């Protein structure tokens, strides 16, 4: 039909209007300076996104989750991880960075900003609830797993570089409180001291053999804790989950004054998110970053492999009806912002992820509309 | 009672929560740089305030205005202008700058950001409609009159300084297109050429006698047009008024897609306005700028003279019932932002206006609550 297409367009165009307004304000009309845009982006990331996430999570009911949908979403990621492990361990071309980038491209779409309105327009409010559950799972688990992988890579790099031969007998790690990351952007020095028994201890502070897995486990856990304790998204997710649990357990209603206090800043989340995405689009030197072959490979992976593995897993478990379609449409969404930020901070193929987010936001309307039409027959 | 007090507090606290959040982010937790705050303020002023004003104006019905309320609001300003004229012309202590500052302090409260929610909570939606009408009148007329006065002062200063003796016989003024203001922040040079008949013409370009009023009228009109053509508020007000007229004449409904496109950025108006006010509060070196005596004089004028002249005019015309109270409560609101911006750009007592806006926002809750209680007996 065409009325449903008009409803989908009505839902999706205002986001693009905000994006184009920001793009023109920076590129055509020359209104905002780069550092002013940085300040707007900082405000958005610190305030508008965490409050929107809190508002979405604290309304979701954790006692009415759809088990099979979560099972399919987890099964596709298990399939992807298995494929990556087999490719990396049993082929000379495999690498950890490529595995991380492929996992991010093929398994982490943008569900918060764009997924909820588009899926609500396409199928209804139950699709919105499913997107909320997916966002909750993504925030609690998959972002934590990405951080685990990034911290493991950083720790491996530090161990390999600092102790090419001495790292054989290391058993303990010490890190000062001033250390916040293992990216390498700062001056990290590890003093070494001989133990009484004969082993060697190392202390990490700010200015090819493997030790046993226990010490890496401890170090990675410490780093992951130190970075989760200083991230607004973790606080938003945890507080929202706890409040949702208690409120749907004891039917407790939040005070109206606190609700309005949260909403007065939560109401700016979607428009400011799209505006900041437009600012990011305008600040880039050119729309396509990596190049023709790399960009077409990334776009093909994002818009084909994700839907393909989603279909395989969904018919494998037994998803049927509109739910199945929802999964496929969820798989074809543009790639998320949080993995892009992670790739920027750890500098693991940031150009490919930037091409992903921006060009996917640009060309998701034709691709998602085509998916909707084909699944509509 | 106390339930009505709780409702008023519920309406007003979230604004202060946003303000305090911004103040702490800049002062306590040190999140935003001064230029990032400037970028946020620029975004707010360019986008969020004009769109909020457009949304409010385009919904108002211009065929159902309350004539007597507008008559009282205009009568108080006529009284103030008459008092200022008598004081300035017939006393050696009178001045134009003092008259402008007193008029701004005593006649221009903040009705858009704070007046509408507070008055809706206090008295109902009809109070909101009255505040919308007041905002429309303020945007169309009184801001234009302020600009007329400021441009007249600038033209007088330029004429007096450039031609202490030659300005007697000037008859025509020419201004190049690059000139945007008469503030003096730029290099303004006025070439003089002798006419064929014998008079002298002057051309203004960017690097005690009075001429007849026609030439000042022409020059001031040209400058006012050149500045109204480059102000988002004028476009917002004009387009909103035209759309409201046609839509309430022919019962035309705006397309839903355009409505959502406007609303996605209009929804951030109130929270971002309060956030920017908090940023302004945090960026100042100290809360009180002018000093103890000047601040107490300005605050006393704002919170006593305005209500007093409002009462005089309202009982003079014959306002009775809650409407009368509304006027008084409208007169005790904190002083507006647009006159403060005007005073900043023309540098006419900016410290007093800054003290006005900030300290009035701080202590309007006790004063307005006291007014509500006393008028409630």
XYZ file of C-alpha atoms in Angstrom:
754
model
C 0.000 0.000 0.000
C 0.918 3.678 0.317
C -0.721 4.930 3.534
C 1.590 2.745 5.628
C 4.513 4.129 3.633
C 3.274 7.636 4.433
C 3.100 6.776 8.142
C 6.653 5.392 8.093
C 7.856 8.512 6.273
C 6.060 10.723 8.802
C 7.843 8.873 11.603
C 11.305 8.973 10.018
C 11.617 12.312 8.144
C 11.816 14.656 11.200
C 15.024 12.901 12.273
C 16.498 13.610 8.839
C 15.203 17.197 8.998
C 17.141 17.740 12.226
C 20.208 16.019 10.752
C 20.115 18.164 7.599
C 19.544 21.312 9.667
C 22.704 20.598 11.661
C 24.630 19.689 8.498
C 23.643 22.946 6.808
C 24.297 25.008 9.932
C 27.874 23.739 10.028
C 28.624 23.395 6.285
C 26.418 25.800 4.301
C 25.385 28.685 6.574
C 28.483 28.493 8.838
C 26.770 29.041 12.188
C 28.664 26.815 14.646
C 32.398 26.599 15.282
C 34.007 23.144 15.606
C 34.527 23.543 19.357
C 30.961 24.794 19.820
C 29.858 21.627 18.021
C 32.103 19.656 20.380
C 30.370 21.304 23.333
C 26.939 20.447 21.940
C 28.055 16.840 21.395
C 29.445 16.671 24.938
C 26.163 17.952 26.364
C 24.195 15.434 24.300
C 26.342 12.461 25.323
C 26.491 13.433 29.004
C 22.840 14.394 29.568
C 20.347 13.710 26.785
C 21.262 10.117 25.876
C 21.639 8.768 29.456
C 18.333 10.344 30.492
C 16.539 8.976 27.424
C 17.973 5.528 28.168
C 16.889 5.805 31.808
C 13.375 6.852 30.779
C 13.095 3.925 28.368
C 14.517 1.315 30.759
C 12.604 2.409 33.878
C 9.304 2.002 31.988
C 10.051 -1.491 30.644
C 8.677 -4.472 32.550
C 11.478 -6.979 33.288
C 8.943 -9.674 34.269
C 7.281 -9.798 30.825
C 10.283 -10.199 28.520
C 9.996 -12.303 25.363
C 12.445 -15.156 25.931
C 12.557 -16.406 22.334
C 13.412 -13.003 20.840
C 16.345 -12.607 23.238
C 17.352 -16.193 22.473
C 17.492 -15.447 18.737
C 19.399 -12.195 19.265
C 21.944 -14.035 21.427
C 22.143 -16.998 19.032
C 23.114 -14.812 16.080
C 25.930 -13.283 18.141
C 27.098 -16.721 19.287
C 27.145 -17.804 15.630
C 29.177 -14.729 14.684
C 31.656 -15.285 17.524
C 32.046 -18.952 16.569
C 32.711 -18.024 12.941
C 35.251 -15.395 14.004
C 37.025 -17.827 16.353
C 37.274 -20.512 13.664
C 38.513 -17.945 11.139
C 41.136 -16.421 13.445
C 42.543 -19.551 15.093
C 42.708 -21.746 11.968
C 43.790 -19.230 9.309
C 46.866 -17.025 8.994
C 44.770 -14.045 7.842
C 42.758 -13.928 11.069
C 43.193 -11.110 13.562
C 41.600 -9.891 16.776
C 40.973 -6.341 15.530
C 39.246 -7.589 12.378
C 37.116 -9.958 14.464
C 36.065 -7.127 16.790
C 35.255 -4.817 13.874
C 33.228 -7.485 12.052
C 31.304 -8.353 15.223
C 30.523 -4.672 15.812
C 29.398 -4.140 12.212
C 27.261 -7.270 11.969
C 25.659 -7.461 15.429
C 25.168 -3.943 16.894
C 22.630 -1.718 15.104
C 21.185 1.586 16.291
C 18.091 0.621 18.258
C 17.720 3.471 20.762
C 17.595 6.653 18.675
C 16.161 5.288 15.413
C 15.009 1.720 16.032
C 12.182 2.474 18.460
C 10.282 5.095 16.374
C 10.783 3.309 13.045
C 9.709 -0.079 14.401
C 6.759 1.446 16.279
C 5.582 3.039 13.032
C 6.142 -0.158 11.045
C 4.572 -2.738 13.374
C 3.265 -1.152 16.599
C 4.087 -0.616 20.255
C 5.011 -4.255 20.922
C 7.904 -3.739 18.513
C 8.895 -0.778 20.673
C 8.902 -3.002 23.752
C 11.062 -5.548 21.915
C 13.493 -2.786 20.933
C 13.619 -1.674 24.575
C 14.489 -5.223 25.655
C 17.198 -5.393 22.979
C 18.628 -2.063 24.166
C 18.670 -3.332 27.759
C 20.532 -6.486 26.722
C 22.968 -4.453 24.608
C 23.714 -2.036 27.452
C 24.124 -4.673 30.163
C 26.034 -7.407 28.303
C 27.308 -6.754 24.780
C 28.886 -3.365 25.489
C 30.532 -4.951 28.535
C 31.820 -7.779 26.322
C 33.205 -5.235 23.850
C 34.963 -3.469 26.721
C 36.322 -6.824 27.914
C 37.769 -7.519 24.464
C 39.264 -4.029 24.138
C 40.860 -4.200 27.591
C 42.208 -7.686 26.848
C 43.789 -6.380 23.641
C 45.312 -3.432 25.494
C 46.684 -5.658 28.254
C 48.143 -8.049 25.675
C 49.822 -5.150 23.876
C 51.259 -3.783 27.131
C 52.545 -7.196 28.240
C 54.071 -7.981 24.843
C 55.777 -4.602 24.472
C 57.050 -4.071 28.026
C 58.246 -7.649 28.699
C 59.139 -9.468 25.463
C 60.934 -12.159 27.495
C 60.331 -11.369 31.192
C 56.532 -11.770 30.948
C 56.917 -15.556 31.266
C 56.934 -15.663 35.079
C 54.723 -12.691 36.011
C 52.050 -13.573 38.568
C 50.586 -10.305 39.945
C 49.598 -6.879 38.622
C 49.322 -3.581 40.502
C 47.724 -0.429 39.084
C 47.703 3.016 40.677
C 44.428 4.892 41.094
C 45.392 7.577 38.559
C 45.359 5.079 35.675
C 42.051 5.198 33.806
C 42.745 3.354 30.527
C 45.162 1.033 28.736
C 44.800 2.774 25.366
C 48.392 4.023 25.382
C 47.562 7.716 24.947
C 49.316 8.287 28.297
C 52.727 7.319 29.668
C 52.308 3.909 31.330
C 55.366 2.536 33.146
C 55.428 -0.844 34.901
C 58.024 -1.215 37.638
C 59.262 -4.763 38.230
C 60.349 -6.204 41.579
C 61.638 -9.672 42.438
C 59.566 -11.575 44.969
C 60.829 -13.324 48.073
C 60.074 -16.768 46.622
C 61.681 -15.864 43.274
C 58.775 -14.737 41.089
C 58.441 -11.242 39.628
C 55.717 -8.702 40.430
C 54.807 -5.692 38.291
C 53.194 -2.364 39.191
C 51.455 -0.238 36.547
C 51.498 3.538 36.977
C 51.095 6.741 34.994
C 54.202 8.877 34.534
C 55.831 -14.882 22.792
C 54.655 -16.691 25.930
C 51.545 -16.198 28.057
C 51.337 -15.932 31.861
C 48.549 -17.997 33.460
C 45.023 -16.814 32.758
C 44.277 -15.909 36.391
C 46.427 -12.768 36.380
C 44.969 -11.498 33.095
C 41.499 -12.230 34.468
C 42.221 -10.143 37.570
C 43.789 -7.259 35.631
C 40.991 -7.143 33.050
C 38.349 -7.259 35.790
C 40.022 -4.351 37.594
C 40.235 -2.257 34.415
C 36.639 -3.035 33.409
C 35.433 -2.016 36.871
C 37.474 1.194 36.796
C 35.931 2.150 33.462
C 32.348 1.095 34.272
C 32.475 3.210 37.439
C 33.007 6.342 35.301
C 30.448 5.980 32.489
C 26.989 7.634 32.565
C 25.414 4.810 30.550
C 26.224 2.221 33.224
C 24.615 4.317 35.966
C 21.577 4.978 33.775
C 21.126 1.288 32.956
C 21.655 0.073 36.527
C 19.408 2.656 38.192
C 16.712 2.169 35.558
C 16.799 -1.608 35.951
C 16.632 -1.433 39.754
C 13.785 1.090 39.669
C 11.889 -0.977 37.098
C 12.301 -4.116 39.211
C 11.057 -2.496 42.421
C 8.265 -0.562 40.679
C 6.882 -3.593 38.843
C 7.309 -5.721 41.977
C 5.495 -3.457 44.461
C 3.484 -1.254 42.039
C 5.217 1.886 43.333
C 4.585 5.143 41.457
C 7.380 7.681 41.087
C 6.711 11.175 42.505
C 5.400 13.571 39.876
C 7.955 16.297 40.642
C 10.898 13.943 40.056
C 9.226 12.645 36.890
C 8.902 16.173 35.493
C 12.464 17.007 36.557
C 13.738 14.022 34.567
C 11.430 14.648 31.600
C 12.336 18.330 31.157
C 15.809 17.193 30.068
C 14.757 13.834 28.598
C 12.464 15.527 26.055
C 15.538 16.872 24.237
C 17.122 13.447 23.736
C 15.941 12.473 20.258
C 16.244 15.858 18.561
C 19.638 16.546 20.113
C 20.867 13.062 19.178
C 19.923 13.623 15.539
C 21.399 17.138 15.651
C 24.685 15.777 17.020
C 24.716 13.107 14.309
C 24.331 15.887 11.749
C 27.197 17.760 13.406
C 29.380 14.648 13.135
C 28.401 14.311 9.470
C 29.311 17.938 8.774
C 32.626 17.845 10.659
C 34.049 15.026 8.525
C 36.298 16.052 5.609
C 34.427 13.800 3.164
C 31.345 11.598 3.364
C 33.116 8.309 2.538
C 36.244 7.759 4.627
C 37.812 4.354 3.948
C 37.351 4.132 0.171
C 35.158 2.542 -2.454
C 36.023 -1.132 -1.926
C 36.221 -0.958 1.869
C 33.014 1.083 2.097
C 31.073 -1.272 -0.166
C 32.368 -4.267 1.808
C 31.325 -2.699 5.125
C 27.908 -1.671 3.799
C 27.334 -5.130 2.315
C 28.287 -6.791 5.604
C 26.006 -4.498 7.626
C 22.965 -4.821 5.365
C 23.318 -8.467 4.266
C 25.181 -10.617 6.803
C 23.210 -9.346 9.794
C 19.823 -10.085 8.228
C 21.136 -13.428 6.947
C 22.364 -14.674 10.332
C 19.206 -13.263 11.927
C 17.076 -15.324 9.541
C 19.179 -18.450 10.070
C 18.949 -18.187 13.862
C 15.266 -17.216 13.873
C 14.027 -20.078 11.700
C 16.444 -22.317 13.635
C 14.771 -21.510 16.959
C 11.323 -21.251 15.390
C 10.431 -17.573 15.168
C 7.342 -17.130 12.989
C 5.016 -14.345 11.938
C 5.635 -10.619 12.294
C 8.123 -11.239 15.121
C 10.453 -12.899 12.612
C 10.104 -9.921 10.273
C 10.840 -7.570 13.169
C 14.130 -9.350 13.824
C 15.150 -8.993 10.183
C 14.177 -5.322 10.140
C 16.103 -4.879 13.383
C 19.163 -6.441 11.745
C 19.116 -4.003 8.797
C 19.199 -0.863 10.960
C 22.200 1.493 10.808
C 25.090 0.527 13.050
C 25.082 1.893 16.583
C 26.850 4.878 18.107
C 28.330 3.256 21.232
C 30.580 0.820 19.292
C 31.636 3.764 17.120
C 32.686 5.691 20.245
C 34.514 2.597 21.509
C 36.379 2.278 18.205
C 37.294 5.965 18.354
C 38.697 5.781 21.882
C 40.624 2.533 21.296
C 41.440 3.449 17.658
C 40.463 0.087 16.148
C 39.309 0.802 12.582
C 37.463 4.053 13.418
C 37.042 5.090 9.783
C 35.071 1.951 8.891
C 32.732 2.420 11.862
C 32.283 6.108 10.998
C 31.413 5.199 7.406
C 29.036 2.607 8.836
C 27.126 4.974 11.110
C 26.949 7.946 8.737
C 26.312 6.237 5.398
C 23.945 3.758 7.052
C 21.934 6.620 8.512
C 21.869 8.137 5.024
C 20.855 5.030 3.053
C 18.841 3.125 5.668
C 15.539 4.536 4.412
C 15.707 2.871 0.949
C 17.188 -0.373 2.308
C 14.800 -0.687 5.253
C 11.859 0.245 3.016
C 12.919 -2.457 0.539
C 13.117 -4.979 3.383
C 9.653 -3.927 4.565
C 8.203 -4.290 1.057
C 9.767 -7.697 0.364
C 8.728 -9.053 3.761
C 5.281 -7.553 3.088
C 4.500 -9.984 0.264
C -4.038 25.827 51.452
C -1.071 23.560 50.728
C -2.091 21.345 47.787
C -2.120 24.357 45.457
C 1.317 25.274 46.795
C 2.463 21.735 46.004
C 1.115 22.045 42.452
C 2.917 25.367 41.948
C 6.129 23.844 43.311
C 5.723 20.837 41.009
C 5.385 23.212 38.060
C 8.339 25.431 38.984
C 11.027 23.178 40.548
C 12.110 21.301 37.358
C 13.217 24.616 35.841
C 15.396 25.227 38.900
C 16.665 21.632 38.743
C 17.886 22.231 35.190
C 19.367 25.598 36.195
C 21.227 24.094 39.166
C 22.419 21.171 37.036
C 23.983 23.592 34.554
C 25.426 25.722 37.369
C 27.056 22.698 38.992
C 28.285 21.326 35.669
C 30.170 24.554 35.009
C 31.176 25.540 38.572
C 31.405 22.419 40.761
C 32.048 19.392 38.529
C 33.844 21.357 35.760
C 32.296 19.629 32.747
C 31.866 22.381 30.136
C 34.424 24.872 28.853
C 33.386 28.533 28.468
C 33.354 28.312 24.666
C 31.382 25.056 24.772
C 28.871 26.912 26.947
C 28.877 29.704 24.361
C 28.081 27.148 21.665
C 25.215 25.723 23.714
C 23.867 29.246 24.280
C 24.160 30.023 20.564
C 22.241 26.868 19.669
C 19.543 27.700 22.217
C 19.097 31.285 21.015
C 19.156 30.386 17.314
C 16.916 27.297 17.357
C 15.114 26.424 20.585
C 13.684 29.830 21.549
C 12.467 30.872 18.054
C 10.792 27.494 17.534
C 9.130 27.612 20.957
C 7.887 31.129 20.194
C 6.591 29.990 16.799
C 4.798 27.022 18.374
C 3.167 29.257 20.982
C 2.150 32.013 18.550
C 0.843 29.754 15.763
C -1.556 28.100 18.239
C -2.965 31.352 19.653
C -6.235 32.653 18.227
C -5.849 36.312 17.159
C -9.642 36.721 16.838
C -10.345 35.985 20.527
C -7.929 38.347 22.278
C -8.913 39.996 25.563
C -8.980 43.708 24.746
C -9.037 44.979 28.336
C -5.965 42.995 29.418
C -3.943 44.394 26.510
C -5.322 47.845 27.317
C -4.067 47.602 30.908
C -0.667 46.271 29.830
C -0.311 49.162 27.370
C -1.607 51.729 29.879
C 1.043 50.851 32.457
C 3.756 51.324 29.826
C 2.249 54.639 28.717
C 2.258 55.741 32.368
C 5.907 54.722 32.728
C 6.905 56.537 29.528
C 5.046 59.673 30.637
C 6.792 59.614 34.016
C 10.177 59.129 32.343
C 9.542 61.977 29.879
C 8.516 64.378 32.651
C 11.533 63.348 34.733
C 14.054 63.684 31.895
C 12.829 66.883 30.233
C 12.132 68.882 33.416
C 15.021 67.802 35.664
C 18.789 68.073 35.270
C 19.299 64.521 36.583
C 17.282 62.945 33.767
C 18.947 60.889 31.058
C 17.941 58.730 28.111
C 19.944 55.680 29.217
C 18.424 55.754 32.704
C 14.943 56.093 31.198
C 15.525 53.093 28.919
C 16.908 50.990 31.776
C 14.022 51.880 34.105
C 11.451 51.123 31.398
C 13.091 47.753 30.718
C 13.233 46.864 34.420
C 9.685 47.937 35.249
C 7.735 46.842 32.156
C 9.332 43.724 30.576
C 9.157 40.518 32.645
C 9.951 36.978 31.524
C 6.656 35.631 30.218
C 7.731 33.036 27.641
C 10.034 30.641 29.499
C 8.684 30.998 33.049
C 5.443 32.977 32.896
C 3.358 30.451 30.965
C 3.962 27.357 33.178
C 3.810 29.268 36.472
C 0.607 31.107 35.560
C -0.982 27.940 34.144
C -0.277 26.174 37.438
C -1.508 29.130 39.492
C -4.754 29.969 37.675
C -5.321 27.709 34.642
C -5.022 27.577 30.871
C -6.753 30.923 30.287
C -3.814 32.516 32.095
C -1.583 30.722 29.601
C -3.544 32.238 26.724
C -3.200 35.691 28.302
C 0.555 35.166 28.647
C 0.696 34.151 24.977
C -1.094 37.367 23.991
C 1.318 39.390 26.140
C 4.290 37.654 24.499
C 2.868 38.422 21.048
C 2.457 42.102 21.935
C 5.958 42.218 23.437
C 7.540 40.642 20.354
C 5.686 42.757 17.792
C 5.727 46.196 19.451
C 7.735 46.736 22.634
C 10.943 45.077 21.429
C 10.625 47.146 18.248
C 10.200 50.283 20.373
C 13.303 49.364 22.381
C 15.226 48.929 19.131
C 13.906 52.298 17.932
C 15.177 53.976 21.102
C 18.573 52.257 20.921
C 19.044 53.172 17.255
C 17.982 56.760 17.969
C 20.574 56.961 20.750
C 23.263 55.548 18.464
C 22.370 57.958 15.662
C 22.409 60.893 18.087
C 25.830 59.849 19.379
C 27.218 59.490 15.849
C 25.796 62.845 14.720
C 27.067 64.655 17.818
C 30.562 63.151 17.675
C 31.205 63.315 13.926
C 29.712 66.779 13.271
C 29.811 68.965 16.399
C 29.097 72.039 14.245
C 28.482 70.797 10.677
C 25.409 68.723 11.630
C 23.257 71.874 11.507
C 22.493 71.699 7.774
C 22.555 67.949 7.050
C 19.527 66.776 5.069
C 20.231 63.235 3.773
C 21.918 60.063 5.019
C 23.444 57.216 3.005
C 24.487 53.866 4.486
C 26.372 51.094 2.708
C 25.032 47.542 2.770
C 27.922 46.257 4.905
C 26.840 48.350 7.906
C 24.765 46.283 10.329
C 24.710 48.356 13.544
C 25.380 51.792 15.020
C 26.822 50.441 18.278
C 30.310 51.763 17.528
C 32.114 48.423 17.855
C 33.182 48.872 14.212
C 34.882 51.689 12.305
C 32.101 53.935 10.968
C 33.173 56.812 8.706
C 30.773 59.398 7.259
C 31.970 61.136 4.108
C 30.587 64.633 3.543
C 29.879 66.160 0.130
C 28.495 69.597 -0.708
C 25.269 69.588 -2.686
C 24.549 71.529 -5.850
C 22.064 73.803 -4.065
C 24.436 74.339 -1.115
C 23.390 71.757 1.479
C 25.615 68.941 2.740
C 25.032 65.206 2.272
C 26.645 62.455 4.343
C 27.382 58.819 3.505
C 27.927 56.255 6.275
C 30.238 53.310 5.618
C 32.351 50.720 7.404
C 36.126 51.097 7.176
C 24.389 71.207 19.968
C 21.789 71.651 17.221
C 19.378 69.161 15.663
C 18.702 68.576 11.950
C 15.006 68.295 11.021
C 13.233 65.192 12.267
C 12.594 63.786 8.775
C 16.205 62.729 8.196
C 16.503 61.040 11.600
C 13.182 59.315 10.925
C 14.487 57.963 7.613
C 17.845 56.861 9.044
C 16.281 55.166 12.076
C 13.725 53.402 9.873
C 16.500 52.104 7.609
C 18.562 50.832 10.554
C 15.546 49.218 12.241
C 14.659 47.442 8.994
C 18.243 46.267 8.489
C 18.293 44.769 11.976
C 14.783 43.258 11.896
C 15.648 41.503 8.627
C 18.420 39.566 10.425
C 16.773 38.405 13.670
C 15.208 34.933 14.113
C 12.598 36.240 16.559
C 11.083 38.576 13.960
C 10.707 35.763 11.420
C 9.236 33.470 14.076
C 6.705 36.081 15.201
C 5.689 37.120 11.682
C 5.335 33.596 10.285
C 3.475 32.435 13.388
C 1.075 35.374 13.233
C 0.372 34.884 9.520
C -0.153 31.141 9.952
C -2.424 31.700 12.955
C -4.486 34.240 11.012
C -4.975 31.994 7.980
C -5.532 28.847 10.069
C -8.162 30.425 12.318
C -9.758 32.130 9.306
C -10.132 29.070 7.050
C -9.807 26.257 9.644
C -6.747 24.854 7.854
C -4.832 22.063 9.604
C -1.055 21.909 9.292
C 0.402 18.702 7.790
C 1.415 16.195 10.449
C 4.925 15.666 9.056
C 5.753 19.383 9.254
C 4.247 19.529 12.748
C 6.492 16.697 13.945
C 9.508 18.242 12.203
C 8.932 21.478 14.122
C 8.130 19.726 17.409
C 11.225 17.493 17.440
C 13.311 20.642 17.957
C 10.655 22.662 19.807
C 10.460 20.073 22.609
C 13.946 21.118 23.759
C 13.060 24.797 24.180
C 12.175 25.022 27.869
C 14.834 22.709 29.282
C 17.591 24.172 27.126
C 16.491 27.721 27.973
C 16.772 26.954 31.687
C 20.092 25.175 31.089
C 21.446 28.227 29.251
C 20.259 30.464 32.091
C 22.205 28.245 34.481
C 25.239 28.543 32.208
C 24.931 32.339 32.330
C 24.673 32.162 36.125
C 27.794 30.003 36.364
C 29.874 32.072 33.927
C 29.551 35.286 35.948
C 32.423 36.111 38.331
C 30.032 36.821 41.217
C 26.284 36.548 41.726
C 25.674 40.258 42.424
C 27.298 42.530 39.842
C 26.443 46.192 40.449
C 26.630 46.310 44.255
C 24.444 46.312 47.328
C 22.678 49.662 46.902
C 22.265 49.430 43.125
C 21.080 45.817 43.321
C 18.546 46.533 46.059
C 17.265 49.556 44.117
C 16.880 47.546 40.900
C 15.218 44.603 42.645
C 12.874 46.925 44.547
C 11.904 48.648 41.297
C 11.284 45.313 39.550
C 9.208 43.765 42.335
C 7.361 46.860 43.613
C 6.927 49.536 40.932
C 5.718 47.118 38.257
C 2.987 45.633 40.449
C 2.083 49.123 41.690
C 1.608 50.644 38.228
C -0.161 47.450 37.138
C -2.638 47.843 39.999
C -3.136 51.551 39.307
C -3.825 50.956 35.609
C -5.982 47.870 36.199
C -8.334 49.430 38.745
C -8.289 52.562 36.558
C -9.636 50.661 33.546
C -11.778 48.375 35.693
C -10.079 44.988 35.828
C -11.716 42.821 38.495
C -11.493 39.268 39.760
C -8.722 36.779 39.041
C -7.776 38.667 35.862
C -6.633 41.583 38.022
C -4.589 39.217 40.184
C -3.070 37.683 37.053
C -1.842 41.098 35.933
C -0.193 41.704 39.300
C 1.408 38.260 39.277
C 2.547 38.928 35.717
C 4.154 42.179 36.874
C 6.179 40.444 39.616
C 7.862 37.956 37.267
C 11.641 38.053 36.728
C 12.799 40.485 34.070
C 13.019 39.188 30.519
C 15.968 37.914 28.508
C 15.487 39.899 25.279
C 15.986 43.329 26.935
C 19.038 41.872 28.684
C 20.485 40.847 25.300
C 19.670 44.307 23.932
C 21.468 45.953 26.859
C 24.466 43.681 26.306
C 24.767 44.480 22.601
C 24.263 48.244 23.040
C 26.115 48.294 26.406
C 23.520 50.365 28.285
C 23.748 49.316 31.947
C 24.265 45.585 31.249
C 25.264 44.757 34.824
C 21.955 45.981 36.267
C 19.958 43.941 33.743
C 22.116 40.872 34.430
C 21.546 41.253 38.174
C 17.853 41.649 37.392
C 17.497 38.475 35.336
C 19.686 36.225 37.491
C 18.728 37.319 41.007
C 15.077 37.654 39.987
C 15.099 34.092 38.697
C 16.675 33.079 42.009
C 14.277 34.870 44.372
C 11.086 35.010 42.294
C 9.710 31.902 44.008
C 9.415 33.508 47.489
C 8.243 36.863 46.103
C 5.706 35.416 43.663
C 4.486 32.973 46.323
C 4.023 35.885 48.744
C 2.061 37.773 46.085
C -0.095 34.692 45.477
C -0.781 34.271 49.205
C -1.637 37.932 49.833
C -3.896 38.092 46.780
C -5.414 34.795 47.968
C -7.030 36.360 51.039
